[PDB]
Amino acid sequence: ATSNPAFDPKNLMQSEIYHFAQNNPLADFSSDKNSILTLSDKRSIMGNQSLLWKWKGGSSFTLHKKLIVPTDKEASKAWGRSSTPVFSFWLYNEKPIDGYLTIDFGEKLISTSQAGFKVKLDFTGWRAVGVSLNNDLELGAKVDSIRFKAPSNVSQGEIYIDRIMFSVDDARYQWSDYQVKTRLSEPEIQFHNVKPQLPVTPENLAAIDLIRQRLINEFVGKETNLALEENISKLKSDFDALNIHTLANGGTQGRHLITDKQIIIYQPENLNSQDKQLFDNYVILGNYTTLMFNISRAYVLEKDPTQKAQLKQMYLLMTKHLLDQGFVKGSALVTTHHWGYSSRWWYISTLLMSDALKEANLQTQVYDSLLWYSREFKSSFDMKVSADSSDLDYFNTLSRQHLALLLLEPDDQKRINLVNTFSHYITGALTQVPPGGKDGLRPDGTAWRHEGNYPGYSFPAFKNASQLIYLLRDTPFSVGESGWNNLKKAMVSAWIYSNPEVGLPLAGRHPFNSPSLKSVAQGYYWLAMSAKSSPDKTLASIYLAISDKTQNESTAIFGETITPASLPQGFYAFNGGAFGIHRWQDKMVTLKAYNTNVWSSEIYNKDNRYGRYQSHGVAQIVSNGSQLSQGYQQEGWDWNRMQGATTIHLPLKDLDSPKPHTLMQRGERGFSGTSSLEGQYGMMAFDLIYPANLERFDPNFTAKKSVLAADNHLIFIGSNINSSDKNKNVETTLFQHAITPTLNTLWINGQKIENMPYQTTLQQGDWLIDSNGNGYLITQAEKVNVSRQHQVSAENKNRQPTEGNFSSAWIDHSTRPKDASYEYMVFLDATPEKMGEMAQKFRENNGLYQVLRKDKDVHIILDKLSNVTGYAFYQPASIEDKWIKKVNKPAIVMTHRQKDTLIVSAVTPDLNMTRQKAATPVTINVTINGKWQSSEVKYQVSGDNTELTFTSYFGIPQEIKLSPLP
Ligand SMILES: CC(=O)N[C@@H]1[C@@H](O[C@@H]2OC(C(=O)O)=C[C@H](O)[C@H]2O)[C@@H](O)[C@@H](COS(=O)(=O)O)O[C@H]1O
Ligand SMILES: CC(=O)N[C@@H]1[C@@H](O[C@@H]2OC(C(=O)O)=C[C@H](O)[C@H]2O)[C@@H](O)[C@@H](COS(=O)(=O)O)O[C@H]1O
Ligand SMILES: [Mg+2]
């Protein structure tokens, strides 16, 4: 407390706090005849004393303090977010009081004299009170009196008060509770309950007790975002620092507990130096509950009976202090928003300490408390399945905490009802196809958060959802097979699109820090061992491969010999992210487009700032292993030159997202993505269309970009390339990788190039091999630039300068001012000898491939090495072709004539939905030349031709094997 008024316009954000650790601490206070005010060091919140107020019913005391109460608009301008001036204090009751305390605000008040509010006194322990002075009183500039009036209908009593504070707070976070009513309320959980009920039986109770033990086993025998401490010396040292002591007739003294979000009410950055020093003695709840967990884990593992007893006493004392500090049912503590960050390991600690809380008679208090603060999570914790139930962050941050809370329910019948309902909730969450862009799994195996396929969020959700299924396995509470099947699809998909990191195109807003399947490994064991017919040999074989374990090691893990999965081979279409994956030997190629339903990039205030081209028809090649070790190095990376993309080469100031905060740029039509044939061949169709009027986006930048992938090779073609400036700085990147001692060699036309710097220009019939063994044969280009150069770039978070040496090659489209084009072929197993053979084959009337059409309506590529034809119908069309006559929608078609059969696949990569609507299936009529007979594809001979009817659901290709009719 200073001599200045609260909310001093001159220093609006500086809190005024009565903590009584200063000179003449009751200077500003006076009492009527019927009240006595003492300082007590028996308990306190801030500094070592609190106000002891003894009273008869109806007696007041007055705090004399000038308040220049700002409007909400003034407070919000001073801070820069929606704000309100708040009055807050802490009070302690040693016994409950059947009545209300009245707090009145006015000018020159005494016991017998504007606005005010009431605090119900029927409780024990510390409670916090926090009200908006503008919004929560039942305030003219001249307020100088705050009058605390003891209840009129209670003959005597006594209350401890501390830390009376005037502050500017976030306008969202003064919550109602059992003591104070505010304009804001977080309603309590109302648990859903599924019928029929499971009975309390010895079998059902044992299954419950087994689930709890299985959770204990997972937390005592390595979690992300858990600060594990197994050293008892360290645990007792951190505990002793808390200075917790049991008090005489009940409660505790010890350092004050506050959450990371609660501190906002202080505006700590603006505290005067006296106040800050006291505030710095607080303990952050996250750290305290982490200590409770590490102690509970040490207790469970501890062999020495004396140490084991000490760990238990430490855990129960920390529990009693936590409850006495007002973390109990009905105590909002003004707010507990983002409760999970502060409490997640408290929930888990109760599993380990469940018998110890039972014996100490704390289970019901701790359950009531955790249930109350969980009300923040009522949308999930109520356990009614809804469109939002497939939340991927929930699976990561909250699902095991939720199960722990249910297991802490003291009644047996209720506990069984809650866990039965939980099993139903998790089954629905893992089974349902959420509408539109909502979080969750999808039928092609993609997994969505922030309204798109997002491995950075899905990978942690896979790990914990697999663990949940495994914890409930082989009990009456086991997750339904439909949820197991869907999660299997998503996790086998993740194995296909990672190597073992997801590519740059799947990195979301963290390019060059891709999630790795290595972090999800244990999930494959947990899902493999929770199969109806366990172990699932596919998931078990993937666990062994991703965790680098041998066939020899398999019997002990799975109870039978399982060969570690070899890397997946062939082509897989994932239109949930308008991508596909081509795999050959140890290489993965991520082919990525974008469209109305697939954002190109997530760009935030400090994330992925130069990410505009992340999905621009990219084709990133990755060998099994570290992408950094293959030269995907952020430092000096030219953000314009994403492998395979057609881009405008911009200065980074113009490539930077035009929005200062968030942009998730969606495309201009539904159609763009991939398709597959026989699980082996693929095609990408990318319609590059820019917005009519977005700053820094050339509205006339266009391209049609197709790729056909088969076996060791990919054929890349482009047409209809344009910009506002005759294709000036328009480029297609063949490759870009750092130069290192392991990545030092390029081959050009049989010559090894190692010099740095180096520039040259190549044309049709030339070839290159990058340092990762990818060959590029130029089959149509006027001008391919190759560069080994020092590059200056900037890092994607804070735009700070970076530099590095890179090998790259790109096509310069400026030589063709209108409707520029390209063709080139990649060999994934290139050697100088093999590239010499491919170049000679290309020179023999192109024995490699044939483009049968390349225009704005259709791209048709015949691969003569694989004998496969890909058809990208950018528009519906009739064509001239041996196989395909007509396609009535934008679609990707693929054919393979083998001996006695024609195999035809078809799909539209268009998901046929919005951010709100469920995807519905698209009917595609594909007419083929000639008479055929035979898959859910329908066929009908119609004159000399055959009509195929495909159903394209969520961009999932269908195919049919046809044989000729006489
Ligand atoms: C606040 C912000 O920039 N973006 C919002 C998202 O917040 C980010 O994502 C998450 C997260 O758990 O997903 C936590 C952090 O606040 C921040 O990194 C998020 O609030 C989304 C909504 O998610 S979605 O319903 O899945 O779309 O909205 C973003 O703009
Ligand atoms: C896509 C995304 O930001 N996802 C969030 C995580 O961020 C990724 O992973 C990590 C990391 O070390 O975990 C760091 C980078 O921010 C990014 O590659 C991460 O912030 C977690 C935090 O989880 S929480 O504390 O465990 O609940 O949330 C991710 O899913
Ligand atoms: Mg104090």
Swiss-Prot record:
Predominant cellular place of this UniProt entry's protein: periplasm
Induction section of the entry: By chondroitin sulfate or its degraded products.
Thermal dependence of catalysis: Optimum temperature is 37 degrees Celsius.
Gene Ontology molecular function: any one: carbohydrate binding
Site residues by UniProt (Important for catalytic activity): 602
Site location (Transition state stabilizer): 509
Pfam family membership, one: Lyase_catalyt
Outcome of mutating residue 450 to A/K/R: Loss of activity on both chondroitin 6-sulfate and dermatan sulfate
Effect listed in the UniProt record for changing residue 661 to A: Still active on both chondroitin 6-sulfate and dermatan sulfate, but with reduced catalytic efficiency
Protein name (Swiss-Prot/TrEMBL): Chondroitin sulfate ABC endolyase
Catalytic activity: Endolytic cleavage of (1->4)-beta-galactosaminic bonds between N-acetylgalactosamine and either D-glucuronic acid or L-iduronic acid to produce a mixture of Delta(4)-unsaturated oligosaccharides of different sizes that are ultimately degraded to Delta(4)-unsaturated tetra- and disaccharides
Binding site for Na(+): 19, 46, 49, 162
A Gene Ontology biological process term: glycosaminoglycan catabolic process
Originating organism: Proteus vulgaris
